[PDB]
Paper text:
Retinoid-related orphan receptor gamma (RORγ) is a transcription factor belonging to a sub-family of nuclear receptors that includes two closely related members RORα and RORβ. The nuclear hormone receptor RORγ regulates transcriptional genes involved in the production of the pro-inflammatory interleukin IL-17 which has been linked to autoimmune diseases such as rheumatoid arthritis, multiple sclerosis and inflammatory bowel disease. This transcriptional activity of RORγ is modulated through a protein-protein interaction involving the activation function 2 (AF2) helix on the ligand binding domain of RORγ and a conserved LXXLL helix motif on coactivator proteins.
However, extensive crystallization efforts with [name] and RORγ518 or other AF2 intact constructs did not produce crystals. We attributed the inability to form crystals to the unfolding of the AF2 helix induced by [name]. We reasoned that if we could remove the unfolded AF2 helix using proteolysis we could produce a binary complex more amenable to crystallization. [name] binds to the ligand binding site of RORγ adopting a collapsed conformation as seen with BIO592 where the two compounds superimpose with an RMSD of 0.72 Å. The majority of the side chains within 4 Å of [name] and BIO592 adopt similar rotomer conformations with the exceptions of Met358 and His479. The change in rotomer conformation of Met358 between the agonist and inverse agonist structures is attributed to the gem-dimethyl group on the larger 7 membered benzoxazinone ring system of [name]. The comparison of the two structures shows that the agonist conformation observed in the BIO592 structure would be perturbed by [name] pushing Met358 into Phe506 of the AF2 helix indicating that Met358 is a trigger for inducing inverse agonism in RORγ.
Residue numbers in the entry: 269 to 487
The structure:
């Protein structure tokens, strides 16, 4: 029952989203003032990474629970669980970020309120921030429903092509169930057209590269 697979993906996503959609949208009005901006800009490059590293660690814990509730994930062998979360958790965080992005004025939700890329100057990788803003922007352009994003993020996480799986047959099968769930849910509702506008897979991996490995220094 593929429909059960959908229903679970959707339910867990609802349960693990970490920030509800209605509060992200209600909070689009609370925008950081120039003094709050400055305030973040004057932090040290250490402090700012400590800070965002915490948040990224928290968000990662939610994705872990998303898979923990994913029907057929816990079936998988412990090794494969770890490989898939290691290689995909961060990619899913970044896709989940597009909910908290507002394309009307190019701001993101960060620590209670909304602001632009200027907020993150103290990280010192303005190129990378501009890229994270771009990517969210073109992702928000799909106007995904909650159900779409749930199924999407599940495929981001269940990819049998990840270097280092033991039971590569068992993941292909889950990946393949999800593909059919997703493609069929899209076609049933005439949303098929969004498949063309999905980011190319390299783009995600690119974006989730070295700048975010080795963050134990910040713990
Ligand atoms: C630059 C470091 N970094 C990243 O590089 C990825 C690819 C994980 C995406 O952006 C991030 C977001 C976050 N955060 C939250 C979380 F947990 F949802 F990820 S966060 O600190 O709240 C945050 C939100 C939005 C932006 C644009 C940035 C730079 C940070 C932390 C680190 C990163």
């Amino acid at each position: 029952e593929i429909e059960h697979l959908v229903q679970s993906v959707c339910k867990s996503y609802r349960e693990t989203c970490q920030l509800r959609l209605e509060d992200l949208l209600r909070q689009r009005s609370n925008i950081f003032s120039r003094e709050e901006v400055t305030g973040y800009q004057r932090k040290s490059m250490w402090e700012m990474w400590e800070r965002c590293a915490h948040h990224l660690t928290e968000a990662i814990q939610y994705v872990v629970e998303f898979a923990k509730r994913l029907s057929g994930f816990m079936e998988l062998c412990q090794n494969d669980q770890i490989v898939l979360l290691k290689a995909g958790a961060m990619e899913v965080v970044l896709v989940r970020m597009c909910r908290a992005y507002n394309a009307d004025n190019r701001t993101v939700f960060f620590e209670g309120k909304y602001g632009g890329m200027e907020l993150f100057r103290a990280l010192g990788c303005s190129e990378l921030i501009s890229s994270i803003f771009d990517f969210s922007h073109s992702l928000s352009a799909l106007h995904f429903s909650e159900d779409e994003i749930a199924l999407y993020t599940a495929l981001v996480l269940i990819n049998a092509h990840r270097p280092g799986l033991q039971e590569k047959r068992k993941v292909e099968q889950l990946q393949y169930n999800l593909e059919l769930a997703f493609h069929h849910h899209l076609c049933k509702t005439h949303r098929q057209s969004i498949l063309a506008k999905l980011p190319p897979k390299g783009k995600l991996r690119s974006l989730c590269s070295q700048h975010v490995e080795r963050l134990q220094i910040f713990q």
